């Protein structure tokens, strides 16, 4: 009975791994997701230069989630580069790189860059289409025209197989359009669902106030809340996408969170907020959680139920 | 003290109505929110004929929300308009009509014979924007070039104020495009902020299955998952629609989570999920318990506090 997969030309222990921006951004979040029992990790999208981010509070939490706008604070492309090129040990577990550049040119410059590293070290590039679009129009992910150009010109740029981060989508005729959209591009390889569910508002009673600071309160939405619009995406692009693998992220708090995934067609399972909130002890518990499912079950390996989701009638 | 409040020329005993669908489609339905303590009531949404819906099960609750893929089941538009005219008691409080047709076309012909009715009893008019659109496309609400239409002909043909049931926007550009769409229209003078949120996927880790039969699983989310969406959308409009009310509908289940509500911008609260789980004996505990905490807090109004929703800096 085993946790471990074999994808994208590496290995990994198990199926867990942080959420892109969850303790993920300095060098030292960097070696404690190296050192947790996470079978990889992600580091905080970024930009070519650093970044502050929004003003503070820009996180919050709660019993069934959690609220952002961080804003995109990171330590600029040449931290992460560097990381990549030479501090992380490779031996210990594979590492993705997550990009969220601010116009599809700053996007091209970094890939370029990051290719000789990818190719050399075996860094995984994970594209962000929520980065902001122009202010104003929709998140890239939601502008289909927008993302077509940007997967167009980073599939040139860096001509090595990357893999995008994607919002959730509510409608069917959006989980045609962009899964057909994405299939335009072999060198997308894995497609990860999702982001945090945009825009929502979360109020606090006594004091009568929204919680963060940023945008009038207004921020995306992970935790509880979202697990079933997350499986949705998953099982979504996990059938539309059938040549593509499907990363699965939101609301994983257990074991059993991260089973639902698998069954909708997950291959790794990210965790954000309640690795926010637990810290990366989290992932002991998780795969142990898991292991215990699938002992009940009977099933010895991942590939046994990933995307065995049943329908009815 | 007392949580009356008059609207759109019509006196209310207080905010709170159930959410079109729930507790609404059948005489019997009808008749027992009539009994309720609710302030109003709406009816089914409603086509020209008849409708069976589609397959069961097609609606399920758990702990934090439920799925539903009714298929919009309705005794038809005669039926509900016969409420209106001959059945329903005023004198009770005030009942709104949900009208759901499959195309533009239908929803005028529903309109055109509503019109008269209204002007003679008062029934008010809730078109619902999540209805079916053309070839491949996005429900009518997510394109708003048909949204614009939808409201032209209905505008046109209705010729009194009217009210639209929306569902959740995710992006602050379509919030802007949204509500500039709206307010285009004089004679829409609510928005109810909002529908479920779209094609979710509840799977349940016993039997490796989705929930509900329809649609492979996929389904509407209402409940406690939706509620700061529900509040994004109510303020987001609250703030861009200033000749317009808003009305409150997403993951009510407590009067603490209608002062939430009312604080964001509601005018009146509705109650789906929360509903069909408790019974119609949830209003008198809502009223109750708003109430209490407007005494706590020194409100001894509703205009007091609504849409006082406090930003940080
Ligand atoms: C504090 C915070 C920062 C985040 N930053 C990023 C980011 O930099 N890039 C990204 O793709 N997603 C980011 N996300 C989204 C998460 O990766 C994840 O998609 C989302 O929180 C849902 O997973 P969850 O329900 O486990 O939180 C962030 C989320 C949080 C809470
Ligand atoms: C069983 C069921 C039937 C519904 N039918 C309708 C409908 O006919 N028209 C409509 O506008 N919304 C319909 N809804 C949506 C609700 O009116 C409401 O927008 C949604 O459930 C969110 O509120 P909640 O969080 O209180 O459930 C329905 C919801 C449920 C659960
Ligand atoms: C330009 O100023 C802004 C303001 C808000 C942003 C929100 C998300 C993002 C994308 C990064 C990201 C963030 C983030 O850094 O806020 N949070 C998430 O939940 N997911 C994300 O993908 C960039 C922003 C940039
Ligand atoms: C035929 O299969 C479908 C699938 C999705 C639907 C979404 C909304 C509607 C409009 C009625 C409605 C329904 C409903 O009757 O399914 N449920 C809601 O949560 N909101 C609604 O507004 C009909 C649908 C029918």
Do not use: W
């Amino acid at each position: 009975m085993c946790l471990k997969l074999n994808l994208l030309d590496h290995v990994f222990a198990n199926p867990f791994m942080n959420a892109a921006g969850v303790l993920c951004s300095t060098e030292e979040d960097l070696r404690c997701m190296t050192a947790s029992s996470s079978g990889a990790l992600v580091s905080k999208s970024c930009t070519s230069a650093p970044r502050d981010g929004n003003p503070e509070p820009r996180y919050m939490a709660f019993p069934l989630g959690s609220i952002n706008s961080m804003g995109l604070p990171n330590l600029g492309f040449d931290f992460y580069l560097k990381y990549a090129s030479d501090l992380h040990d490779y031996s210990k577990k594979p590492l993705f790189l997550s990009i969220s550049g601010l116009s599809v040119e700053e996007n091209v410059a970094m890939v370029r860059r990051l290719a000789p590293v990818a190719q050399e070290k075996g860094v995984l590039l994970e594209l962000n289409l929520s980065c902001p679009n122009v202010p104003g129009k929709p998140q890239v992910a939601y502008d289909f025209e927008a993302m077509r150009t940007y997967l167009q010109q980073v599939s040139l740029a860096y001509g090595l197989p990357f893999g995008v981060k994607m919002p959730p989508y509510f409608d069917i005729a959006h989980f045609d359009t962009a899964a057909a959209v994405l299939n335009e591009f072999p060198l997308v390889k894995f497609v990860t669902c999702v982001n945090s569910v945009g825009n929502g508002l979360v109020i606090d009673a006594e004091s009568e106030s929204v919680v963060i600071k940023p945008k009038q309160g207004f921020g995306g939405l992970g935790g509880k809340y979202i697990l079933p619009t997350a499986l949705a995406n998953v099982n979504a692009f996990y059938r539309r996408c059938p040549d593509k693998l499907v990363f699965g992220c939101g609301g994983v708090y257990s074991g059993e969170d991260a089973f639902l995934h698998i069954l909708a067609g997950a291959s790794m399972v990210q965790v954000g907020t309640a690795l926010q909130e637990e810290g990366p002890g989290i992932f002991t518990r998780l795969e142990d959680e898991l292991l215990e499912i699938m002992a009940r079950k009977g099933y010895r390996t991942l590939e046994e139920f990933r995307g065995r989701v049943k329908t009815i009638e």
